[PDB]
């Protein structure tokens, strides 16, 4: 199917320096996510195997930020992700050659990570549906492909159960992942000194304290309206007093009935 | 009509289960509380002629669609009426013996409204002279007080082991392929067993077999019957609520 | 009531017992009669009735008799019909729901509906040349007179044009009376609210709906059949 | 195919964005909004954004007459794609995308130009099909594989018509809101049809901004050439007041019918 | 149960020797809530009926739909079981599963003599159902004339307006029937109340009837 | 053909044996004699007249971790294995549990003698008096009767686990039928460090554990949820620094996932 290429993703993207305020799950995923590749013989002598990954789920929030974040993270190459709202479509069955396929090629990458993000749209008549998750269940928790490399599902509710009770199988490390704190806004900001000409008298901490509940996703939209009013603006250079307007008008009137 | 190449296609061999029932000597209640079996006799007569394989599974009145399971207690009857001989069987009859006590639900009113129809065609305007039915089933008490009427059973078969005659015959024919030492006793495995079930008793003195043969010894001693047949059957008798 | 036996006896039966009296009595083709009204389930009974007081042959035709893939199997059959009528005896053709076989088209998606709406042109030019000593009568019943194609509406071909009322009182009455005269007679069995509150919510086949009530009143735990399945038959079906 | 040389105009209309008053910060909007990639690039490729995705409107009166005047900016000197109803969709069995496939690769091979679609009636007018050639529109239209290559603008009627699904990938540059034309737009509409046209000093505008309801400016410009030739009728171009309310009387029926 | 078929058949001895044998039959019932007294007066027995309420039993037991022995004597057309129930002290306003009382199906069998031991043990001549229906509705609708006359011996009120707005008026003339129009008329039906179809009691009747309604109106 | 069905699992052999638990010999000894006697004396079979039963029910409280050890028992069975759930037979689409019995029995009878081992057959066996459940005496009532109208049935066993006894179908006694009914209950503080122990044979456990402090903190625990405890001190002991397992990890295990 077209889908499959289309669905191939190599494009440097957000690096670590966007780590949202988790201070223990930085470091609970960090530990699974950079730590296995840089040192394999470490965790097989030191132990039986090297840990297996990290759930992150719930609120969505500025969610997909973290997900780019492991793209860009590896020092090597970065890995293939895998959306799960491609597998609704007319004349189902592409599911199971699908993940056959990319298996395949992942037993071809020579044990490269393979991401399924979405899997919310994939699971929860729907027997159809059962044929290629429970399929994508048995082509996890079978160990034929690698039962080593990487599992980290991304849902917005709790609502699939076949997932969560399949899951303990080979799955584990449930995280949460909600909002940063006061000193990640200005990293984010860190991560937004290549983004739009911000002129040097613009503090990052200024602006990142001067709006609460602004996690990464809400200030990219900060970002992105205030970067187009700073375009429409007909100026060299962006200054904060002339899109503080864009930025509390951004989170505060639609912060009103949102 | 895809149940009829069923009922019309199967054939179970085997003539001398009629004589292998033990000491045994319009409708049929067979309730076996302390004792099975009902499926050897039925299929032991059954399988000798039965003159057709008309059986009727209790599962085949689902009817997960709207409840007009009419056409298929007139079709079937109405084959039953057309065709000369017929046999018609009624095994595990308690799963749709609802006694409709309480406010039934629509899933138990079609039941009970097939088992109204049953009514019409059992004491209704329709003689069932040259049929005959055979309700078999577990329990006396969810037997449908409504249906238990004398018009319809006139006698009561509990298939049981109150001789000792049909104990020992049972236990004699189940004991046929099986070797023993030279002491033979009888009297204990028959006297001690009160009030169990046939082919549960075949599976206890089996079961008895295999507790022996751990010893991989190829004589089998009464011993081993009377201790594995009266510890097993007490296990029975716990697992008997 | 009486209007529509009265009107079907003389117009319909009269004629039909009587051989080459149509051009001495008055010549006239009623020929075509037509009822309409959808809520009067109609077009059973009557029938009957025609079928119990005349003693020859019925040819009972509903409309969608001859949709199927073969176009040309349309006259015929209608044909076949025509001829063992016309050669036999003098039978009663009933066509019912016209309404499907007999509105406009001006595309040729349903080519189909055109060709045997073309066929129905073909015998409705057969009948105005069957004028003379025709052995068939062609009742007709319809339950949507909007759709209708003017041409059968043009006088000549259809006319009588009956109608049902909404409250069949005597239909009830006559219902209720034919099913309780072969049932056990309860006196206290009464008719009136179930003669009014079908005035309110009128149906079909109330026939039926009197055996369904015995289907519910066969517990054999109530003798004779009561209110509590007349009402529930109701509120079920 | 003869649908595909009806979807895209090539001429060069001289309606340019100094043409229409009134909302001109609405036109400068979208003006400064898909005019600064590939035109005037020192503000755009300098920042380092490049949001290849372009601003969605909709327009009250449509008709092609608001949203056309408003994508009429970008037809001065450039080259156009438009793209008018959903018909082409459901007038032929369900092909699926490759319709926007298609689209997609004259827009590939034609990377300077506007995407312009109009009368975005998809799910307001089998219908199952719809929904997944839909979503399956916004995936080809999101871009998850090329880069900035052409600026998507899309223009409906009802904005209670699309789904909230297809408004978070599609729409994510900037939107705004169209004001009501009642008088004083309408005046302005009247102004512009009647601006190369002459007509006469008895020609009153309070009864044609009051006798109209919600008209959009197809009509008007129906009235403006049939009063042009049946004031062109006597071999005069002037457009006297009783010639101009005999064809107002198209207006009063028009929409009242 | 067996005391269906004793009571049913009419089994004199076998009723007795039943009952006299075992006294819990006469309270038991069937699986639709229905006693002894309800088989004996559908079935129409004196002798039964007088041994069970000689005994004692509660005259207003009713089944699950709330039907009352009295319609069952009323519909009936048997004077002598409305003679015992009356006797017993049965409630003349009984409230049925529709609502009714015993005077529609007292009146539904043409019953003068029931009619009148009723209404003059205190039922309500103007006792309306849950369809804001009297006796007179029915009665008209089927040509009871001297049971309307009958409840005109009491007073009854001829203007009840029904569940669509029809007065007895309005179901008289919709029955076709002469007689009866103008005897309500004469005894002070109204011709100006309308129902929710918006239709006068003249334009209801056909052949020019209102006409002459009218005209004993103004007459 | 409809390899869905036919092709549900498709396993050879399991690694684990029966040499992994501790403490249930003088319970699982009948189905080690149970599943070893039927496959290799079958020439006695013709001399003493036995015939194995088809049926066993190997029932009990959840979490027990039935499954991994009838696999186990499977490992010594040496035939083909073929796990089997429970909600498979509900389907959209009518009469297609009469597919999937008649193609397990299609398999088990035409090809060669395997072993099917089903889970979760409480979850679906309720008898109730349209509903679902009925259709699952349909499709249950119609395996009862090939399993009690076939006297051909001596081919290979069908082996079925409950998780819980609560709806006790009184239909489920017969000799071809669940007639072995061996009770497993919860094992004890003893039995729980016995498989423990033989479960976590391979990690580098220290040798000064008195199993008190553990036999205290299990208590009213399942098999399952302490291999659950083995994996995860098996996770954090690797990212602890030390390869040898502590003795905190245990409580730390039980405390973190319950």
Same mark, same amino acid.
């Given at each position: ?258 | ?241 | ?237 | ?257 | ?35 002894? @007294? &309800?088989?004996?007066? *559908?079935? $129409?027995?004196?002798? /039964? #009926?007088?041994? =069970? %309420?000689?005994? !004692?039993?509660? +005259? ?9 022995? @009295? &319609?069952?004597?009323? *519909?009936? $057309?048997?004077?002598? /079981? #409305?003679?015992? =129930? %009356?006797?017993? !002290?049965?409630? +003349? ?9 015993? @005077? &529609?199906?007292?009146? *539904?069998?043409?019953?003068?003599? /029931?009619?009148?031991? =009723? %209404?003059?043990? !205190? ?13 007179? &509705? ?12 009958? =409840? %005109? ?67 | ?258």
């Amino acid at each position: 199917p077209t889908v499959t290429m289309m669905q191939v993703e190599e494009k440097p993207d957000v690096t670590y320096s966007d780590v949202g305020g988790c201070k223990e799950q930085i470091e609970k995923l960090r530990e699974v996510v950079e730590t296995p590749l840089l040192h394999p013989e470490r965790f097989v002598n030191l132990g039986i195997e090297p840990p297996k990954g990290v759930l992150l789920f719930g609120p969505p929030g500025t969610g997909k930020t973290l997900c780019a974040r492991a793209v860009a993270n590896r020092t090597d190459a970065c890995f293939i992700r895998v959306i799960g709202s491609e597998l609704v479509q007319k004349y189902v069955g592409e599911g199971a050659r699908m993940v056959r396929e990319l298996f395949e090629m992942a037993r071809t990458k020579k044990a490269c990570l393979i991401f399924f993000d979405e899997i919310d749209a994939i699971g929860g008549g729907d027997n159809e549906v059962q044929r290629t998750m429970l399929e994508l269940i048995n082509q996890l928790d079978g160990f034929d492909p690698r039962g080593n490399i990487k599992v980290l599902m991304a849902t917005n509710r709790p609502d699939t159960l076949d997932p969560a009770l399949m899951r303990p199988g080979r799955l584990d490390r449930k995280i949460e992942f909600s909002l940063p704190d006061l000193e990640g806004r200005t990293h984010i900001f860190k991560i937004h000194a290549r983004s739009m000409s911000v002129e040097r008298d613009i503090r990052f901490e200024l602006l990142a304290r001067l709006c609460p509940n602004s996690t990464g996703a809400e200030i990219r939209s900060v970002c992105t309206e205030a970067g187009m009013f700073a375009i429409r603006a007909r100026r060299k250079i962006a200054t904060e007093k002339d899109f503080l307007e864009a930025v509390n008008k951004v989170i505060k009137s639609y912060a009103k009935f949102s | 009509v895809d149940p009829l190449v069923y009922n019309m296609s199967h054939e179970d061999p085997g003539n001398v289960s009629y004589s292998e029932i033990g000491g045994l000597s319009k409708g049929c209640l067979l309730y076996g509380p302390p004792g099975t079996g009902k499926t050897l006799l039925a299929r032991a007569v059954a399988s000798q002629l039965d003159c057709n394989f008309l059986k009727v599974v209790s599962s085949s009145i689902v009817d997960k669609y709207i409840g007009e399971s009419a056409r298929l207690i007139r079709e079937m009857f109405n084959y039953a009426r057309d065709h000369q001989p017929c046999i018609i069987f009624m095994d595990e009859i308690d799963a749709i013996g609802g006694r409709r006590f309480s406010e039934g639900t629509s899933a138990d009113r079609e039941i009970q409204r097939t088992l109204m129809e049953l009514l019409n065609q059992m004491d209704g305007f329709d003689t069932l002279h040259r049929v005959k039915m055979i309700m078999a089933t577990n329990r006396p008490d969810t037997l449908d007080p409504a249906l238990l009427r004398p018009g319809r059973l006139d006698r009561k078969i509990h298939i049981d082991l109150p001789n000792e005659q049909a104990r020992l015959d049972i236990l004699k024919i189940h004991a046929g392929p099986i070797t023993k030492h030279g002491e033979i006793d009888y009297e204990a495995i028959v006297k001690l067993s009160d009030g169990f079930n046939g082919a549960d008793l075949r599976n206890v003195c089996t079961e008895a077999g295999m507790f022996a043969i751990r010893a991989d010894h190829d004589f089998v001693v009464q011993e081993d019957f009377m201790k594995a047949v009266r510890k097993v059957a007490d296990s029975k008798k716990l697992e008997s609520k | 009531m009486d209007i529509q036996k009265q009107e079907v006896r003389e117009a319909v039966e009269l004629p039909l017992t009587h051989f080459e009296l149509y051009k001495q009595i008055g010549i006239d083709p009623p020929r075509g009669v037509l009822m309409y009204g959808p809520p009067g389930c109609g077009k059973t009974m009557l029938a009957k009735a025609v079928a119990h007081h005349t003693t020859a042959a019925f040819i009972r035709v509903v409309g969608s008799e001859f949709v199927q893939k073969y176009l040309g199997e349309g006259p015929r059959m209608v044909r076949d019909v025509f001829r063992l009528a016309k050669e036999n005896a003098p039978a009663i053709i009933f066509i019912d729901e016209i309404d499907a076989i007999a509105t406009k088209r001006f595309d040729a998606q349903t080519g189909a509906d055109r060709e045997v709406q073309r066929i129905l042109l073909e015998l409705l030019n057969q009948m105005d040349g069957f004028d003379q000593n025709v052995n068939v009568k062609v009742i007709m019943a319809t339950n949507r007179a909007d759709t209708l194609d003017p041409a059968l509406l043009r006088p000549g071909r259809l006319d009588r044009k009956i109608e049902f009322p909404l409250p069949d009182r005597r239909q009830k009455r006559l219902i209720f009376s034919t099913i309780t005269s072969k049932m056990n007679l309860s006196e206290e069995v009464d008719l009136e609210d179930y003669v009014a509150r079908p005035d309110k919510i009128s149906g079909a086949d109330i026939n039926s709906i009197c055996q369904e009530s015995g289907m519910l009143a066969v517990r054999e735990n109530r003798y004779i059949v009561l209110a509590k399945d007349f009402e529930k038959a109701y509120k079920t079906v | 195919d003869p649908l595909v040389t009806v979807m895209k105009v090539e001429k060069a209309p001289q309606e340019t964005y100094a043409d229409i008053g009134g909302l001109d910060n609405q036109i400068q909007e979208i003006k400064e909004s898909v005019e600064l990639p590939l035109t005037h690039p020192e503000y755009y490729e300098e920042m380092g954004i490049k949001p290849p995705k372009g601003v969605i409107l909709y327009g009250p009166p449509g008709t092609g007459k608001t949203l056309l005047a408003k994508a009429v900016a970008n037809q001065t000197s450039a080259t156009f794609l438009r793209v008018v109803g959903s018909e082409l969709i459901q007038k032929y069995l369900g092909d699926g995308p490759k319709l926007v496939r298609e689209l997609f690769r004259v827009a590939e091979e034609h990377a300077p130009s506007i995407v312009f679609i109009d009368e975005i009636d998809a799910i307001g007018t089998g219908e199952r099909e719809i929904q997944r050639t839909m979503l399956e529109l916004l995936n080809q239209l999101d871009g998850f594989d090329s880069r900035g290559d052409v600026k998507v603008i899309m223009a409906t009627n009802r904005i209670e018509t699309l789904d909230p699904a297809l408004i978070r990938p599609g729409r994510i540059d900037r939107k705004i809101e169209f004001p009501l034309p009642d008088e004083k737009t309408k005046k302005r509409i009247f102004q512009i049809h009647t601006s190369r046209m002459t007509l006469a000093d008895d020609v009153t505008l309070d009864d044609l901004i009051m006798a109209k309801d919600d008209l959009s400016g197809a009509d008007i410009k129906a009235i403006c050439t049939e009063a042009g030739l049946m004031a062109l009728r006597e071999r005069r171009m002037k457009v006297t007041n009783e010639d101009f309310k005999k064809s107002k009387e198209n207006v009063l029926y028009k929409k009242q019918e | 149960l067996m005391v269906c078929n004793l009571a049913y058949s009419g089994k004199l001895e076998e009723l007795k020797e039943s009952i006299l044998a075992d006294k819990s039959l006469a309270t038991r019932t069937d699986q639709d809530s229905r006693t002894a @007294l &309800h088989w004996a007066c *559908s079935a $129409g027995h004196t002798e /039964i #009926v007088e041994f =069970l %309420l000689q005994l !004692g039993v509660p +005259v207003n037991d009713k089944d699950d739909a709330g039907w009352s022995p @009295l &319609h069952i004597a009323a *519909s009936a $057309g048997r004077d002598e /079981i #409305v003679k015992a =129930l %009356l006797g017993k !002290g049965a409630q +003349v306003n009984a409230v049925n599963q529709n609502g009714c009382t015993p @005077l &529609h199906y007292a009146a *539904s069998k043409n019953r003068h003599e /029931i009619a009148v031991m =009723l %209404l003059e043990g !205190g039922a309500n001549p103007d006792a309306k159902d849950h369809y804001e229906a009297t006796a007179m &509705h029915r009665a008209a609708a089927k040509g009871n004339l001297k049971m309307i006359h009958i =409840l %005109l011996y009491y007073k009854a009120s001829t203007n009840i307006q029904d569940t669509e707005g029809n007065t007895p008026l309005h179901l008289a003339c919709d029955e076709e029937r002469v007689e009866e129009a103008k005897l309500l008329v004469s005894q002070g039906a109204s011709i100006y109340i309308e129902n929710k179809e918006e239709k006068t009691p003249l334009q209801v009747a056909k052949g020019g009837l209102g006409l002459i309604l009218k005209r004993m109106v103004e007459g | 053909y409809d390899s869905r069905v036919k092709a549900m699992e498709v396993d050879e052999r399991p690694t684990e044996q029966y040499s992994d638990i501790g403490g249930l010999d003088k319970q699982i000894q009948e189905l080690v004699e149970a599943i070893v006697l039927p496959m290799n004396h079958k020439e006695k079979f013709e001399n003493l007249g036995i015939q194995p039963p088809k049926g066993v029910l190997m029932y009990g409280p959840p979490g027990t971790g039935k499954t991994l050890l009838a696999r186990a028992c499977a490992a010594q069975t040496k035939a083909t294995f073929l796990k089997l759930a429970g909600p498979q037979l509900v389907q959209m689409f009518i009469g297609d549990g009469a597919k999937l019995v008649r193609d397990a029995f299609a398999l088990a009878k035409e090809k060669a003698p395997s072993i099917i081992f089903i889970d979760e057959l409480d979850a679906i066996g309720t008898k109730r008096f349209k509903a679902g459940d009925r259709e699952v005496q349909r499709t249950m009532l119609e395996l009862l009767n090939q399993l009690d109208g076939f006297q051909p049935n001596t081919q290979v066993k069908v082996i079925a686990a409950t998780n819980r006894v609560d709806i006790l179908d009184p239909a489920l006694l017969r000799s071809g039928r669940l007639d072995r009914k061996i009770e497993f209950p919860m094992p004890n503080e003893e039995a729980r460090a016995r498989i423990m122990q033989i479960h976590s044979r391979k990690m580098n456990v220290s040798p000064d554990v008195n199993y008190e402090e553990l036999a205290r903190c299990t208590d009213d625990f399942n098999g399952a949820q302490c291999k659950a405890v083995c994996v995860e001190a098996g996770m954090i002991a690797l990212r602890r620094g030390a390869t040898e397992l502590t003795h905190e990890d245990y409580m730390e295990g039980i405390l973190e996932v319950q």
